[PDB]
Amino acid sequence: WRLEILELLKNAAVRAGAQACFTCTLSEAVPVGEASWYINGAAVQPDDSDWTVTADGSHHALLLRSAQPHHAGEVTFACRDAVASARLTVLGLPDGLEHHHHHH
């Protein structure tokens, strides 16, 4: 019956074509106004195309479609005594090599 913050997903890096997963499972549902979801460098308008925000009960879900070298910025969220932060960054260097061979 309380409003204790259970778990928050922070710290996220998204390369080109990747996706972002930010959610905050609370103990109480908050309407629209006491909850603030924004990343410095790109305010999410009700019609935001790159970012998507929703609120259903005690669960707040926010994502990032295909990350592009420009969405980089800080991550700050606040609610019912629910303080949060993070660091969002996108890689634009195709210097990231990956192993395409699972096994040999």
UniProtKB/Swiss-Prot annotation:
<comment type="function">
    <text>Structural component of striated muscles which plays a role in myofibrillogenesis. Probably involved in the assembly of myosin into sarcomeric A bands in striated muscle. Has serine/threonine protein kinase activity and phosphorylates N-cadherin CDH2 and sodium/potassium-transporting ATPase subunit ATP1B1.</text>
</comment>
<protein>
    <recommendedName>
        <fullName>Obscurin</fullName>
    </recommendedName>
</protein>
<comment type="similarity">
    <text>Belongs to the protein kinase superfamily. CAMK Ser/Thr protein kinase family.</text>
</comment>
<feature type="disulfide bond">
    <location>
        <begin position="24"/>
        <end position="79"/>
    </location>
</feature>
<comment type="subunit">
    <text>Interacts (via protein kinase domain 2) with CDH2 and (via protein kinase domain 1) with ATP1B1. Isoform 3 interacts with TTN/titin and calmodulin. Isoform 3 interacts with ANK1 isoform Mu17/ank1.5.</text>
</comment>
<feature type="domain" description="Ig-like 46">
    <location>
        <begin position="1"/>
        <end position="89"/>
    </location>
</feature>
